[PDB]
Design a protein around this ligand. Structure first.
Ligand code: SF4
Ligand SMILES: [O]
Length: 753
């Protein structure tokens, strides 16, 4: 038995490939078929491999993740619910990463120093909560959670859960990394089996090879166009084929990462020599050697069946740019000029933003600087404003030394801190007035409405960072780097050649500024105090328990039309300063959702006063008057970010049930965790039989059972009524979260009482 540590920070915690193999063998003895790669790693992590019922797309798997990671905008509510379980330390290796509260304003350390003084209370809280419960802490400036995870923590066959959507990024290193809400991470840190609905598996076969301007990003921008934002729901995306071996480890992380934008449970690549070179370049040669020895369990079984198969010829794939308000509106960079002209999107690119998490590696920085260096050899600088986020302090230190940062700086770039920044709206913008219509190209992944700067006329197009650079040098959406014009002030030769770059540093990486903090061995006398008067941090008052009765005469707060992401339910940006305080953050509840009645964001009819106004105020009026309510939603309600606040905030403001045509995975788990009832129309046309005025009775809660539909009476103002049926995906574990008022109350009644 090998004793290879999980990371450089937990030398006493070994990789368990013998347990994985042990459990894969038990499960294929029961299933008697080839297993996909994701099936190998997921079923190899089952708590009961001998007795787990296993069926893709319908069974709930009780899993034992190897580690947990949180970022600081979702770590706050996850550790208040861990505090509340009153466990003295966490059960598996866990980390907090301080990357979401650093606002981009001046660049680099002006901004970082600013964020340390502005978010001192929260960073203190998380640092002393981590020292006490045994959670590793990555300080402000360390880097974006996924980038530190890929560098330090992801390895082949790991099962990692993270309180973030883009945790799937770690699949570029052959692990299964799945985003969850804080209350799931609390389960695994507390020692509870993590339950996951058995994924269906999409195979993406890659043939050929990536060439010239076409980069990793374009493979997932293509797949997202192909499959749409809803197409990966309840499935893990598995890349296979001849062309996989043409992709660097960090470009495999890029493809796995944006898979979140099709709603996939996660995405993964098979262990290969590009993962082995990346493990060795990051000081984890021993993990690559161990994985080689278990490679059979870290690739798919020959002949495994994918439920859906898509083919992408890498060699004929050419550059993409997606948007403007959904990540699945895919355009080749060549036709994006002509189609923006046609559709009424600005061709002027105000700001080009490279980096942030999907695309912030040393290869992304080398390819961006290779474009920028050419512009510079012709005495050119950017016509658009340009920002660069390094993915981690290691990448910042290594590209500084290898000179990429000075080239990016010299074409007019501002290197921002190693933090999300612009990506979740931690950006103090300035170049446009409020409501100005503008374009911005970014190498991020999401381009939801007003996500970046809190302005809706902002058309955000996502693409590769080398395309963001060249298009920032050009200033317009009608420049296609592959064919077109350059001048310089020398007057000469027009064309930007294909940005060649170094995959990894040819010397060793430079680590930089010292950013990690170990939990002390004996943490006796770590008080983690939360001020009772703090406006940033507040303890969670347990939600009420279910009174045993049905839900009669529910008022509709809002019937939502169309696309309703977690950014519509609970916006980020200025709202991240309250992510530790549920009553203050509940003031953004569904302010961005579109009301079907008037098609306005944030004005719904108050049913008592008949005055239209803000959705949070109306919810608070109903709660204070004892009027219970529901949201009626359309398709894939709760798409996007994993923030469990989307679920905590309707519960806190008096909500009882959300009834939709369908839900995104993670938000539906969170609504069940907080004691709400996520329900779906058995017939989605029934959405049209429910009008804003109608009162709803959900009946037969007293017989709430797995697989049994609930009925709903739609009581029309005029005395007619009609009964429809509502489906749910609750199992008995989850029904007992409902009955107890939340999964936290259910844990608390199990701890004696
Ligand atoms: S998507 Fe943006 S806010 Fe979410 S983790 Fe990545 S960089 Fe940070
Ligand atoms: O994210």
């Amino acid at each position: 038995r090998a004793k290879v540590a999980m990371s450089h920070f937990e030398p006493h915690e070994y990789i368990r490939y013998d347990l994985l193999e042990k459990n894969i063998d038990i499960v294929r003895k029961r299933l008697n078929r080839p297993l996909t790669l994701s099936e190998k790693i997921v079923y190899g992590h089952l708590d009961d491999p001998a007795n787990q019922e296993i069926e893709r797309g319908k069974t709930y798997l009780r899993l034992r993740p190897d580690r947990v990671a949180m970022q600081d905008a979702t770590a706050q509510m996850a550790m208040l619910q861990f505090i509340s379980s009153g466990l003295p330390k966490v059960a598996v290796p866990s980390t907090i990463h301080c990357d979401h509260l650093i606002e981009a304003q001046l660049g680099g350390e002006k901004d970082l120093r600013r964020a340390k003084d502005i978010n001192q209370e929260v960073y203190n809280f998380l640092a002393t909560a981590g020292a006490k419960y045994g959670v590793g802490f990555w300080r402000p400036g360390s880097g974006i959670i996924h980038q530190i995870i890929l560098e330090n923590y992801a390895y082949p066959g790991v099962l990692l859960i993270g309180t973030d959507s883009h945790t799937p990024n770690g699949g570029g290193l052959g692990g299964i990394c799945i985003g969850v809400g804080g209350a799931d991470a609390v389960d695994v840190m507390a020692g509870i089996p993590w339950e996951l609905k058995c994924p269906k598996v999409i195979g993406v076969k890659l043939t050929g090879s990536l060439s010239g301007w076409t980069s990793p990003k374009d493979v997932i921008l293509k797949v997202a166009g192909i499959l749409t934002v809803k197409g990966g729901t309840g499935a893990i995306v598995e890349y296979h084929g001849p062309g996989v071996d043409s992709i660097s480890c960090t470009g495999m992380a890029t493809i796995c990462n944006m898979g979140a934008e099709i709603g996939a449970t996660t995405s993964v690549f098979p262990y290969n020599h590009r993962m082995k070179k990346y493990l060795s370049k990051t000081g984890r040669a021993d993990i690559a050697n161990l994985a080689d020895e278990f490679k059979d369990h870290l690739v798919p079984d020959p002949g495994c069946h994918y439920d859906q198969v898509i083919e992408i010829n890498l060699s004929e794939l050419k550059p993409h740019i997606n948007g403007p308000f959904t990540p699945d509106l895919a355009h080749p960079v060549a036709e994006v000029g002509s189609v923006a002209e046609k559709e009424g999107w600005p061709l002027d690119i105000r700001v080009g933003l490279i980096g942030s998490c999907t695309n912030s590696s040393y290869e992304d920085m080398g390819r961006s600087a290779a474009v920028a260096k050419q512009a510079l050899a012709h005495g050119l600088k950017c016509k658009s404003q340009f920002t660069i986020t390094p993915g981690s302090e290691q990448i910042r230190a290594t590209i500084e030394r290898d000179g990429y940062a000075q080239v990016l700086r010299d074409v007019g770039g501002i290197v921002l801190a190693n933090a999300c920044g612009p990506c979740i709206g931690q950006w103090d913008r300035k170049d446009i007035k409020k409501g100005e219509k503008n374009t911005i190209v970014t190498s991020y992944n999401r381009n939801f409405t007003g996500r970046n700067d809190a302005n809706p006329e902002t058309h955000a197009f996502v693409t590769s960072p080398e395309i963001v650079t060249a298009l920032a040098i050009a200033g317009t959406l009608k420049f296609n780097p592959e064919t077109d014009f350059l001048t310089g002030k020398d007057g000469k030769k027009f064309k930007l050649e294909a940005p060649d770059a170094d995959e990894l540093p040819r010397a060793e990486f430079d680590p930089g500024q010292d950013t990690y903090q170990h939990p002390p061995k004996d943490s006796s006398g770590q008080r983690v105090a939360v001020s009772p008067t703090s406006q940033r941090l507040q303890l969670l008052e347990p939600f009420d328990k279910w009174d045993g009765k049905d839900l009669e005469d529910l008022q509709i707060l809002i019937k939502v039309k169309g696309k309703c992401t977690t950014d519509h339910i609970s916006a980020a940006g200025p709202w991240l300063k309250f992510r530790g305080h549920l009553d203050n953050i509940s003031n953004n509840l569904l302010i961005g959702a579109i009301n079907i009645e008037n098609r306005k964001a944030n004005s719904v009819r108050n049913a008592v006063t008949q005055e239209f106004g803000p959705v949070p105020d109306t919810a608070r009026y109903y709660k204070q008057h004892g009027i219970r309510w529901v949201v009626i939603g359309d398709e894939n309600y709760g798409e996007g970010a994993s923030r469990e606040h989307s679920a905590l905030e309707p519960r806190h403001l008096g909500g009882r049930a959300i009834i939709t045509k369908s839900f995104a995975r993670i938000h539906e788990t969170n609504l069940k965790k907080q004691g709400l009832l996520p329900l779906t129309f058995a017939d989605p046309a029934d959405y049209n039989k429910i009008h804003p005025v109608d009162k709803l009775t959900i009946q037969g809660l007293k017989d709430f059972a797995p697989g049994k539909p609930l009925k709903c009476i739609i009581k029309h103002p005029n005395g007619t009524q009609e009964t429809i049926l509502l489906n749910h995906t609750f199992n008995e574990t989850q029904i007992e979260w409902f009955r107890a008022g939340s999964a936290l109350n259910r844990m608390k009644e199990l701890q004696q009482k």
